[PDB]
Amino acid sequence: TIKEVVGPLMAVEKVSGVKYEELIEVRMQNGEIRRGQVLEVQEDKAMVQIFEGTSGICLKNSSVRFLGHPLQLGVSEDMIGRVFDGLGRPKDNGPEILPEKYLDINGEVINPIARDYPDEFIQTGISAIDHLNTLVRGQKLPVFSGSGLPHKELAAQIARQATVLDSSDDFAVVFAAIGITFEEAEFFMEDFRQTGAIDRSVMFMNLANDPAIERIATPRMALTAAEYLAYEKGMHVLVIMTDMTNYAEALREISAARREVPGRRGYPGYLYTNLATLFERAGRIRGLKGSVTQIPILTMPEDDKTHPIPDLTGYITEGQIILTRELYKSGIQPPIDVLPSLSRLKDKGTGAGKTREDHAATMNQLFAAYAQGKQAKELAVVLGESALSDIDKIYAKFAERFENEYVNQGFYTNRTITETLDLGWELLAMLPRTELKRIKDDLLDK
Amino acid sequence: MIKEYRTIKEVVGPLMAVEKVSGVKYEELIEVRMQNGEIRRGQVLEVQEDKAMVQIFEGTSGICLKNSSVRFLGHPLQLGVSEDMIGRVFDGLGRPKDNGPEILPEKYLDINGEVINPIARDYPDEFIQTGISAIDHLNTLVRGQKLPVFSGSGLPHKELAAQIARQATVLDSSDDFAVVFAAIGITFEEAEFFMEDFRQTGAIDRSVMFMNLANDPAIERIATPRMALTAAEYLAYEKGMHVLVIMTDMTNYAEALREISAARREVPGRRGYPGYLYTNLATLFERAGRIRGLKGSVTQIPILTMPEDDKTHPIPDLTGYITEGQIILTRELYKSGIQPPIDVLPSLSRLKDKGTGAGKTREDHAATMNQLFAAYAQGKQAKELAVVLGESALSDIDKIYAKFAERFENEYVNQGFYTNRTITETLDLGWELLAMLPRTELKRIKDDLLDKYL
Amino acid sequence: MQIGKIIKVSGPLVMAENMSEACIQDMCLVGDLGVIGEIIEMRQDVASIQVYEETSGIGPGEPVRSTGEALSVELGPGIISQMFDGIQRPLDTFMEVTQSNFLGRGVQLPALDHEKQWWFEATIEEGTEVSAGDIIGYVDETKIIQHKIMVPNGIKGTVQKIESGSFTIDDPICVIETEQGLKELTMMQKWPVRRGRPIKQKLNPDVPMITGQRVIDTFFPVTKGGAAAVPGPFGAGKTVVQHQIAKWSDVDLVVYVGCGERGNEMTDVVNEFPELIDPNTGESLMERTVLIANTSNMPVAAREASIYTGITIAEYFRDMGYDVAIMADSTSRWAEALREMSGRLEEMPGDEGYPAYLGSRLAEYYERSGRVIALGSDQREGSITAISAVSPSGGDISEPVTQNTLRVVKVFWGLDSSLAQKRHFPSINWIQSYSLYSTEVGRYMDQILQQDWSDMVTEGMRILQEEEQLNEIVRLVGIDSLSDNDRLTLEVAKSIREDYLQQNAFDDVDTFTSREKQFNMLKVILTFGKEARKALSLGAYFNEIMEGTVAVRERISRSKYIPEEELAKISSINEEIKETIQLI
Ligand SMILES: Nc1ncnc2c1ncn2[C@@H]1O[C@H](COP(=O)(O)OP(=O)(O)O)[C@@H](O)[C@H]1O
Numbered sequence A: 001t002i003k004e005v006v007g008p009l010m011a012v013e014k015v016s017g018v019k020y021e022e023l024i025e026v027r028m029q030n031g032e033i034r035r036g037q038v039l040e041v042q043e044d045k046a047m048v049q050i051f052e053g054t055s056g057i058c059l060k061n062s063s064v065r066f067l068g069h070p071l072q073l074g075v076s077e078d079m080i081g082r083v084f085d086g087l088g089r090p091k092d093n094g095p096e097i098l099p100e101k102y103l104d105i106n107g108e109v110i111n112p113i114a115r116d117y118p119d120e121f122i123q124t125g126i127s128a129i130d131h132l133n134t135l136v137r138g139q140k141l142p143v144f145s146g147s148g149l150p151h152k153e154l155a156a157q158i159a160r161q162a163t164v165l166d167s168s169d170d171f172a173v174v175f176a177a178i179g180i181t182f183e184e185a186e187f188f189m190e191d192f193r194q195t196g197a198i199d200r201s202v203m204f205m206n207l208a209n210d211p212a213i214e215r216i217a218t219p220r221m222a223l224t225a226a227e228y229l230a231y232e233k234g235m236h237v238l239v240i241m242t243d244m245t246n247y248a249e250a251l252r253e254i255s256a257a258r259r260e261v262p263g264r265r266g267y268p269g270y271l272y273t274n275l276a277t278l279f280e281r282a283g284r285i286r287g288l289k290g291s292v293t294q295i296p297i298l299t300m301p302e303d304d305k306t307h308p309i310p311d312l313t314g315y316i317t318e319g320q321i322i323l324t325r326e327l328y329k330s331g332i333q334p335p336i337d338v339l340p341s342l343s344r345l346k347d348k349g350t351g352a353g354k355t356r357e358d359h360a361a362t363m364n365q366l367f368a369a370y371a372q373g374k375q376a377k378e379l380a381v382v383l384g385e386s387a388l389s390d391i392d393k394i395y396a397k398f399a400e401r402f403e404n405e406y407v408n409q410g411f412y413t414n415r416t417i418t419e420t421l422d423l424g425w426e427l428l429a430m431l432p433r434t435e436l437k438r439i440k441d442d443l444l445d446k
Numbered sequence B: 001m002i003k004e005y006r007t008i009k010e011v012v013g014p015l016m017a018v019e020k021v022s023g024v025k026y027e028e029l030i031e032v033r034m035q036n037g038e039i040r041r042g043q044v045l046e047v048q049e050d051k052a053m054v055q056i057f058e059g060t061s062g063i064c065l066k067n068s069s070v071r072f073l074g075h076p077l078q079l080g081v082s083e084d085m086i087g088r089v090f091d092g093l094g095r096p097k098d099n100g101p102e103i104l105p106e107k108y109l110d111i112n113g114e115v116i117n118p119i120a121r122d123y124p125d126e127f128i129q130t131g132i133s134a135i136d137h138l139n140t141l142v143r144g145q146k147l148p149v150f151s152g153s154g155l156p157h158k159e160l161a162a163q164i165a166r167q168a169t170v171l172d173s174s175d176d177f178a179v180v181f182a183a184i185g186i187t188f189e190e191a192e193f194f195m196e197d198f199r200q201t202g203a204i205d206r207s208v209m210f211m212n213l214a215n216d217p218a219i220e221r222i223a224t225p226r227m228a229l230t231a232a233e234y235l236a237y238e239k240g241m242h243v244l245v246i247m248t249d250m251t252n253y254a255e256a257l258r259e260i261s262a263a264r265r266e267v268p269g270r271r272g273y274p275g276y277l278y279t280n281l282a283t284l285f286e287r288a289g290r291i292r293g294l295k296g297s298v299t300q301i302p303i304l305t306m307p308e309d310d311k312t313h314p315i316p317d318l319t320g321y322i323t324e325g326q327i328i329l330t331r332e333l334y335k336s337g338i339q340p341p342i343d344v345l346p347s348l349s350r351l352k353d354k355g356t357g358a359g360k361t362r363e364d365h366a367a368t369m370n371q372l373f374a375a376y377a378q379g380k381q382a383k384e385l386a387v388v389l390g391e392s393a394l395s396d397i398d399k400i401y402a403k404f405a406e407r408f409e410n411e412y413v414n415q416g417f418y419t420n421r422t423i424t425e426t427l428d429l430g431w432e433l434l435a436m437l438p439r440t441e442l443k444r445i446k447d448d449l450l451d452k453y454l
Numbered sequence C: 001m002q003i004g005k006i007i008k009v010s011g012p013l014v015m016a017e018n019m020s021e022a023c024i025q026d027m028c029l030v031g032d033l034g035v036i037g038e039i040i041e042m043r044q045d046v047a048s049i050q051v052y053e054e055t056s057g058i059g060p061g062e063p064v065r066s067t068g069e070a071l072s073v074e075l076g077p078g079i080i081s082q083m084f085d086g087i088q089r090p091l092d093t094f095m096e097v098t099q100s101n102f103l104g105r106g107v108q109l110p111a112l113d114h115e116k117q118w119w120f121e122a123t124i125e126e127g128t129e130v131s132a133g134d135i136i137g138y139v140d141e142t143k144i145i146q147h148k149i150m151v152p153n154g155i156k157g158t159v160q161k162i163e164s165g166s167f168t169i170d171d172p173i174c175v176i177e178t179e180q181g182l183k184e185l186t187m188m189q190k191w192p193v194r195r196g197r198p199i200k201q202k203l204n205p206d207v208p209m210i211t212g213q214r215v216i217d218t219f220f221p222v223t224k225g226g227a228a229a230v231p232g233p234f235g236a237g238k239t240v241v242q243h244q245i246a247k248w249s250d251v252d253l254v255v256y257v258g259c260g261e262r263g264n265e266m267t268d269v270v271n272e273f274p275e276l277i278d279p280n281t282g283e284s285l286m287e288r289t290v291l292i293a294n295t296s297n298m299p300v301a302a303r304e305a306s307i308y309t310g311i312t313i314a315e316y317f318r319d320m321g322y323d324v325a326i327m328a329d330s331t332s333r334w335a336e337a338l339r340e341m342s343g344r345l346e347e348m349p350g351d352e353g354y355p356a357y358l359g360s361r362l363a364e365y366y367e368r369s370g371r372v373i374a375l376g377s378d379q380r381e382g383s384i385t386a387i388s389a390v391s392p393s394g395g396d397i398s399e400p401v402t403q404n405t406l407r408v409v410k411v412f413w414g415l416d417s418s419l420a421q422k423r424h425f426p427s428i429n430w431i432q433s434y435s436l437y438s439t440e441v442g443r444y445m446d447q448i449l450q451q452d453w454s455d456m457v458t459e460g461m462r463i464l465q466e467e468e469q470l471n472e473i474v475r476l477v478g479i480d481s482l483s484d485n486d487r488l489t490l491e492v493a494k495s496i497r498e499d500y501l502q503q504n505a506f507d508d509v510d511t512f513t514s515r516e517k518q519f520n521m522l523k524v525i526l527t528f529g530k531e532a533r534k535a536l537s538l539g540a541y542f543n544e545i546m547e548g549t550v551a552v553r554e555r556i557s558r559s560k561y562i563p564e565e566e567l568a569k570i571s572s573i574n575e576e577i578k579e580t581i582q583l584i
């Protein structure tokens, strides 16, 4: 039945009723069984890509059967505490899950008017986030990183320290590793076990040397499990995905297999659609208990904010968390630069009844003072740094203490929202009361 | 014999393919009759055997391949000419848009026109008193010359356009300019500004206007200059008129040309612009000039906005390579409230040699032309360092130059958008515009004209 | 009709034979599911189709049907107060019928209600010659908005039968005797979104629009039928401006367009708009608004036609003789959708990857807005005011989307990031921004107010510009290096920035400011300047003036919070200023 075997691809004749992205099964001449996926289908033939590759396949004495169904996920409540493949296969030497049902990994499209206002506060335990760029339930808050930047530890710290206060009913964390090395993959899987965070999390681990079609199926596999736990089990689900850059690169390979002309910067034209189709599988829904919160993580090529991957993402997600090379070289952990970072829904998760009543003001105070203190340091370098204003001098020492003490908290240090706000006041206590943007009734926190 | 094919083979984007044809020529004009009565104009891009690849002006959206008709006209894109075009307003394709009596054209002419034999050409030397001294003295215009204005977005090049149209005319002659105006890819309110100004001044009663808007088809924006020039060469070389042609915006024309090129899947040249941009623009600007034994002339004044105020941009650069000079408008001058904001240093005229000394002024102010050039140069270098730093190197040989600039830009070059001054006045003000520099400073060959007037 | 047959499914691309009777740009239902597709190419009877939904599970053999038309919109009673998407799918009907919070793949629902009974009130008599745009009757769709039934374009003849009655949008209400014969009309008409609706004549937009936003109406005003662009960095206030304009503009109908858009950001408009009520009518904002809400998750064809879907609807009510304001947020995400299709169609890219016809598409969009004479015997006047937000990367406006937009519009509200961090909202750069309607508007203002208002705005701009020049001297030399007159100008300019330009959109009172309140507020700010100027000329010192005017300057800053029924409490400040300064 097999007509051609070109590299990782395959041409199969006698196709009838074969659908796009339908799974196939190959029985080789020696009895080895491999599976594949339809990338392109015509009346006379169909193009498929084998998961296990095409090396050592005899064209003459091999047979192929079509399964009549695409990639599916065996969903169940027993997924909690389990580590899976990029294809949803058990990766942790545990018992096979008895499925409640089998679902499509493409999911459904949420109605734009079916969404609720982002409401609750998610304590990531990191001061740079919770205070200045607050994560809210249902929000899509991404992390923009670069080659060599410690986004690995940041992903591990968030997935470990993230909690919902005070209501702790059905909170889960779905982690998706996409096309990363084994070291980075093992680091995550080990950290989830040692800390006990595995007991409430679901993992889908995909490696760099896995075929590009598996890398593409990985985010769809994880999000399907998440929306299952969210909508059908009413769980508060937080989803973390890295690296999203690997996902975009995988698309280029498949697009070239179908011989599609590359778009801007070498990526397929439908890159915008694909990212949006993944990321917009989140947010609170009217008439649904559970929800999906996403933290997509990506590395910007050449640290370029104008690159398609971070540029398109910003048009989809409500803000971003920036990691800079400057702060990393300074020893700041995490190296979060608060000036270019943003959370567009932070006010929806702060105030009173959530966090504390002094959240918003100190945030605006710390932000204004850090920016001004950062500027005063520039004047010091060019001027004598000896005749600068007495008030300005404190601002410079404030900006330094803000980066080394406040932002640089560590990758294994968990701060409650109260501890974060209290430390903010001790930093604001360096300046006189005449230089604040907080109200006079904020003399209860000094 | 009327030709019409009713079977279309292939439609890929804006491109079409018609089979089983014969006698179809290159650049032939076609018409497509839609199923809802609509008629779209098209153009034959290429012909192989019994096939013809054509492009539709209004796009191929909503076109059936079995329920449509493609009429081949047997002629390229033409213009209907007549005696009664003056006072009328036309489309980008030469169709009436002023709702007056529709004219029965005497004949139809190819809008590509024909190339004037360089031997049959009559070199331009008749001086035009534009009224503007920055132009009239230093960058002198001549009947038959192609002299464009390089400006930028927000700058008063529209005010300068109308000004020149108002007050420009030939000396010691009864000849009055017949203005052919061509708006290219501009907005409605931009086009309404010209329609209003031409009516108030009465310039419409002596003009032909070809109004092409911004949301008109890109091909129509390309065809508009050739429509206007065909009408210009008609009124000049067949009616004996001295035609003044004004086009804006040429930047829009180039952008339309770039869009059309990409639609035809042509590989972009420098900065994404077509390789034939020089050639394409040259088929427009070379249409100007005079002819031996024929009365009348064609004078062009192209107008364009330089992208990001960059002169090295392909559009003004290739324009400068073709045209006989350029008039530059800068924001630094315009910020000083100067109208027109003409910078004479980047400005130039290539035909100012025979225009000067003949129509004016027997070297009376033809001679100072190279001085005010050379003196304003050092006058600017001096004013540059003397403003940012302290006392100038000399208050007689270096700060004296600074004195001859500030007022000689606020006065000598100022003029006015609705203000008209004669050349005599300009050469009058000019000798007084050297305020204030002593006889030591004027390093010219003559001592005669330094004594006649101050 | 003819039924196609899929021969190839490759990604979002679908090939189908038996499509000889199809036309280019026709909308199609692909496969057994009938997912949304569009014909882009055609060779003999093989059509190339772009599918804007998931093609997973679709293969050769499955049927393909054409809708017999390009992307169009149903225009008739039942369109007001509805929330569609880019391809005009009823989002509310989707949730009520399917009882799900999702958009079912291949689910087809009519945009308007085709079962609802409207009372049609015929207003024309039989035997009357009718043409396109002629009103044959109306429907009271809302308490205020009269939905006027018009003769569709392409129809011309004599009215044979017509009578008032309760019909649906499917029931025939009028029969016109044409050259072809008998033609039935209904209360609904179809129109392609990519084609502009015909008019009788285009006019100049000379009537200023009251937005309530002080910085806008005073210094950079836009007219009814004008166009304004709002570029800027992220978090600068683009959206807040779009909100404020949508709910305060003196306009008959609003067409808001998510291009677009972020998922949790689209939620704001959907929930907030039906909650706002005009005190005069008791009606909600939605009752005069047609909403186009697109998330980034929506099909790219819907995201690309989003602004064309909206302006087609805007044109529909424009022909009826109403003033319509259409909002676009954000056009950069519309252009990004256009850029996506350019790559998917495998075209030759222009600047920055955008299609080479980007400038044309933007030109086509904004030239469909404006004050016009609608078709019909009445020769009535309608207008469309286009206000679009632009989101360039890094706030750099030298990018194609912004530059091409500023080439076809006359109003530019440039957002400044340094201003937004000063809590200076709206963050409009008073130095860089401009309005090419300023002269004409000020002329209109002087007539309707009977005041020297145009001189007030000019003087106001003069002071702000002098502030910019002086601030450089304050940076090079000391603040004590300025004369008392220079010190005064900075204080007057400070009052203009803080008491006037700054406007909180979330404050109950400060969210809106009528034309008269703007006049009185600017009057007392300039009055303080004049009196203090004259005082300095009479020997008074700068410090003595400020120390003795603490209370009255306090009353000036809070004048923005004075209720609209107590405008006299702003005018009385003029006297307090004089008497206070005269004492000093
Ligand atoms: N007129 C205003 N009054 C008060 N706050 C404003 C105003 N305009 C903007 N803001 C603040 O600035 C932020 C920017 O909001 P948004 O309009 O979404 O930014 P952009 O659209 O420019 O990205 C908002 O969260 C809002 O709190």
Ligand SMILES: [Mg+2]
Pocket (backbone or CB within 6 Å): C238, C239
């Ligand atoms: Mg916004």
